[PDB]
C-alpha cells in the first residue's frame, strides 16, 4: 500500500508601508528629431518608428508580489 | 491500495499601506519631429509610426498581486 | 482501490489602503510633427500612423489581482 | 509759487505658476485627551478650551500679494 | 519758486515657477494628554487650553509678495 499526505501550511505575510509617494517626473523625448532621406531602395519588409514611443511611468502604492506553486505527481 | 490526501492550507496576506500617492507628471514627445523623404522605393510591406504612440501612465493605489497554482496528476 | 481527496483551503487576503491618489498629468505629443514626402513608390501593403495614438492613463484605486488555478487529472 | 507733480508709474508683475498642488493631509488632535478635576475653587473669570480648536488648512493656488501706498501731504 | 517732480518708474517682476507641489503631512498632537488636578485655588482670572489648538498648514502655489511705499511731504 501507499499513503501520501500533502499538508503544506502557509501563514506568511508580504507587506509594505509608505508615508508618502510622489513628485515623480518622466519627460522622454524633449529634444528635436530630424530624419532626412534621399534615394533609398528597400527590397524586403520595413518597420520604422520615429519620435516618442512606448515610454512607461508605473507607480503602484504597494506593488508587492507573491507566487506559489504546488504539484504532486504520481506514477 | 493507494490513498492521496491533498490539503494545502493558506492563511497568507499580501498588503500595502500608502499615506498619499500623487503629483505624477509624464510628458513624452515634447520636441519637434521632422521627417523629409524623397525618391524612396519599397518592394515589400511597410509599417511606419511617427509622433507619440503607446505611452503609458499606470498608477494603482495597491497593485498587489497573488498567483497560486495547484496540480495533482495521477497515472 | 484508489482514493483521492482534494481539499485545498484558502483564507488569504490581498489588500491595499491609500490615503489619497491624484494630481496625475499625462501630456504626450506636445511637439510639432511635420512629414513631407515626394516621389515615393510602394509595391506592397502600407500601414502608417502619424500624431498621438494609443496613449493610456490608468489610475485604479485598488488594482489588486488574485489568480488561482486548480487541476486534478486522472488516467 | 509752488508746483508739485506726482506721476509714479507702475508696470510691475507678481506671478506664479504651479504644475500641480495637492495630496495635503492635516490631522491635529489624534490622541486621547483626559481631564479629571476635583475640589477646585475659582474666584474670578475662567476661560477653558479642551479638544481640537482653531486648526487651519489654507491652500491657495496663487496666494500672491501686492500692497502699495501713496501719500502726498502739503502744509 | 519751487518745482518738485516725482516720477518713479517700476518695471519690476516677482515670479515663481514650480513643477509640482505636494505630499505634505502635518500631524500635531498624536500623543495622549492627561491632566489631573486636586485642591487648587485661583483668586484671579484663569485661561486654560488643553489638546491640539491653532495648528496651521499653509501651502500657497505662489506666495510671492510685493510691498511698495511712496510718500512726499512738503512744509
Numbering used by the authors:
A (entry chain C), B (entry chain A), C (entry chain D), D (entry chain E), E (entry chain B): 305 to 379
Which of the paper's sentences describe this entry?
Three types of filaments were observed that were made of two identical protofilaments arranged in different ways. Filament structures were determined to resolutions ranging from 2.3 to 3.4 Å, which allowed us to establish their identity as CTE filament Types I-III. Types I-III of CTE filaments were present in the frontal cortex, with only Types I and II being found in the temporal cortex. The three types of filaments are molecular polymorphs consisting of two identical protofilaments that are linked in different ways. By cryo-EM, the tau fold was identical to that in CTE, SSPE and ALS/PDC. This is the first inherited tauopathy with the CTE fold.
Dominantly inherited mutation D395G in the gene encoding valosin-containing protein causes vacuolar tauopathy, a type of behavioural-variant frontotemporal dementia, with marked vacuolation and abundant filamentous tau inclusions made of all six brain isoforms. We used cryo-EM to determine the structures of tau filaments extracted from the frontal and temporal cortices of the individual with vacuolar tauopathy. The ordered cores of the filaments span residues K274-R379 of three-repeat tau and S305-R379 of four-repeat tau. The CTE tau fold differs from the Alzheimer fold by having a more open conformation of the β-helix region, which contains an internal density of unknown identity.
